[PDB]
Design a protein around this ligand. Structure first.
Ligand SMILES: [Fe+3]
Length: 660
């Protein structure tokens, strides 16, 4: 009945092989068009510059390049995915100025669900009309106090075709260079000891998109006239990869500490180009190019019980980030054609000895939870410190004290009410990994620049009597000292700096209602937001790039589904409709290369779907779907407004999964 979370068993009844399709019933997240990292993400209209994907509680905030979205995990690795729309209190961790996607990798215990034994094999296959094929396999089990798992998954997707009316630069229906060969695996071993009180989990996960991909992944190929032509978009072979090595600890009843949760991880993002020759951003490195972002981090979270219903929570977060290119290239630095200035400038850039940019985030927090007779009060405090070192070796540091509090009030067994007022900070992000080389100039940080500081406020209610269900939230957010890294990535300027450049206001709401009577499930959801960026700098420093957000149109979703008892079988309808949207995220208007009058056409997608459980149980699903049944030609709103990447046209899908 809840659209904000999807569980594993739910996903086994589903035919989708990426997050955007998996979460399409949740209205306050929106995805852009295109495949893999073509996709930008928004939460309440706010972009990946602000919203993190945390998997097993490991996450970074750096990007590869402003023309592509931050990597979004492959759902076949996860036992559960949540959207926390809100933020969270003092113990949410580093940078939680907005909500997040939260995901946890799958477990032996999870894969074992269907079965009457301690070991197992899983096989899946999928076929998609528009257009691709997927298969994988998984082995897992538990013995003595150990659990272990190995999973392999591959989704080979061809170029997809848009809905009725869209044409290619060469007259065809498909989206050029939208093919990716997607591979992922997971190795996991865990142990439970200390008379069942202590648990250790060690895991390694790879997730790799490989294919023929444009310079700027957010665009395809337009005709020879447009800035988007075949030699300007210049598609070589590329491999983009997320990796994650995680060590997780969990203790209960450890003296005066009631619960301890700890984790240490390494997180790598790599970009491999076969030939970056015709890619200016990467510096036209001829042949093989490798860019890497490494994130090391550590979290310790403690809970001590102070009275029968009063918990004290305290802990530490440390995160280190390192951008690491193949090689610096500020040597090749060049300005086009007072130009006396240019010359003193090329000179400057050439004499610079560049090094790997780094960012350390440290946090400590304390939080109290007091609960009495259906009324819960949470109050809390964080100290956030950061250190940023740019590729020019310059170091800037700041710290903040962040208070937060909230209440949950439950007067009655069907109803509950919540609100909160949280402060949180986010430290400047490092400039695009792919430009770190310096060819286009030095990217520094001005003296004394501060963390963006967010004030989040919200109220909501929740109602559920086993048959009707309903939920609502209203939220407000101010972000002060919004950071702007230097926005123009074309153009060669000698020294430019990240600064506090203005402030951000956003407000809006979501509603959900549902009805479930033996077999029949009905759901509706609506969500609307209003992110607005204000420049407080003479130079208007803020930008309308999708990484930041977009004014999405009011989004409505709905589904209707019936589960039969004979056979075990569910048929369903699902739709997402988004209304006409008007306006930039920027108050001062956004501009071409001149003032753009932004309007995003509205559109409606319908899907039908089926899930057939032939053995009367969860070990074999045969699923069938038809997505975008009317073959609606449209463009998602979470992306630029000039007609970039369409949403997939009618797609038909059949997937099977089988544990035994
Ligand atoms: Fe560009």
């Amino acid at each position: 009945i809840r659209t904000n979370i999807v569980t594993l068993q739910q996903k086994d009844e589903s035919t989708a092989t990426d997050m955007r399709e998996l979460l399409k019933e949740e209205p306050s997240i929106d995805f852009g068009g295109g495949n893999g990292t073509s996709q930008f993400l928004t939460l309440r209209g706010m972009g990946q510059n602000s919203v993190d994907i945390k998997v097993d509680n490991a996450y970074s905030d750096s990007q590869i390049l402003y023309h592509q979205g931050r990597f979004i995990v492959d759902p076949a690795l996860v036992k559960v995915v949540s959207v926390q729309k809100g933020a969270g209190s003092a113990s949410a961790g580093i940078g939680a100025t907005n909500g997040a996607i939260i995901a946890k990798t799958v477990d032996a215990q999870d894969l074992l669900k269907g079965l009457d034994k301690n070991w197992g094999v899983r096989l899946n296959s999928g076929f998609a009309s528009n257009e691709g094929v997927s298969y994988g396999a998984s082995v897992f089990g538990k013995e003595g106090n150990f659990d272990g798992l190995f999973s392999y998954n591959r989704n080979d997707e061809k170029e997809y075709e848009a809905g009725k009316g869209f044409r290619n630069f060469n007259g065809g229906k498909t989206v050029p260079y939208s093919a990716l060969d997607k591979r992922s695996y997971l190795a996991k071993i865990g142990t439970t000891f200390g008379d069942g009180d202590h648990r250790i989990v060690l895991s390694h996960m790879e997730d790799q998109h490989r294919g023929i991909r444009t310079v700027r992944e957010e665009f395809t190929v337009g005709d020879a006239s447009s800035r988007t032509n075949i030699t300007r978009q210049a598609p070589p072979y590329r491999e983009t990869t997320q990796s994650n090595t995680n060590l997780a600890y969990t203790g209960k009843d450890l003296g005066f500490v009631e619960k301890l949760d700890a984790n240490a991880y390494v997180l790598e993002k790599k970009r491999y180009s076969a030939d970056d020759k015709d890619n200016g951003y990467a510096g036209n490195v001829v042949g093989p190019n490798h860019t890497r972002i490494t994130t090391r981090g550590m979290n310790f979270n403690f809970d001590s019980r102070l009275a029968e219903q009063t918990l004290l929570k305290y802990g530490i977060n440390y995160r280190h980030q390192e951008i690491k290119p193949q090689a610096f290239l500020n040597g090749e630095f060049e300005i086009s054609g007072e130009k006396a200035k240019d010359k003193k400038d090329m000179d400057l850039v050439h004499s610079y000895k560049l090094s790997n940019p780094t960012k350390t985030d440290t946090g400590a927090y304390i939080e109290a939870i007091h609960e009495l007779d259906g009324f819960t009060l949470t109050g809390g405090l964080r100290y956030d410190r950061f250190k940023v070192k740019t590729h020019d070796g310059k170091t800037v540091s700041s710290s903040n004290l962040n208070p937060s509090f909230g209440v949950i009030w439950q007067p009655h067994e069907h109803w509950s009410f919540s609100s909160s007022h949280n402060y949180a900070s986010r430290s400047p992000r490092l400039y695009d990994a792919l430009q770190t080389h310096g060819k286009r100039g030095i990217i520094s940080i001005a003296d004394g620049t501060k963390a963006e500081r967010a004030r989040n406020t919200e109220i909501g209610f929740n109602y559920n009597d086993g048959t009707f269900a309903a939920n609502g939230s209203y939220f407000w957010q101010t972000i002060k000292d919004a950071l702007a890294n230097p926005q123009n990535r074309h153009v060669s300027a000698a020294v430019r700096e990240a600064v506090n450049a203005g402030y951000i206001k956003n407000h809006g709401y979501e509603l959900g209602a549902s009805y479930r009577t033996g077999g029949l499930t009905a759901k509706v959801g609506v969500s609307h937001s209003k992110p607005r960026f204000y420049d407080t700098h003479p130079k208007k420093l803020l930008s309308a790039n999708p990484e930041f957000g977009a004014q999405v149109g009011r989004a409505w979703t709905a589904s209707l589904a019936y589960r039969f008892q004979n056979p075990n079988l569910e048929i369903g309808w699902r739709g997402r409709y988004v209304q006409k949207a008007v306006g930039s995220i920027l108050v001062a208007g956004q501009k071409d290369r001149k003032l753009e009058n932004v309007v995003r056409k509205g559109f409606g997608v319908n899907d039908v779907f089926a899930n057939w459980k032939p053995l009367g149980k969860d070990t074999l699903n045969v699923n069938l779907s038809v997505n975008n049944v009317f073959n609606t030609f449209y463009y998602p709103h979470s992306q630029r407004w000039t007609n970039t990447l369409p949403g997939v046209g009618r797609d038909v899908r059949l997937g099977v999964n089988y544990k035994f």
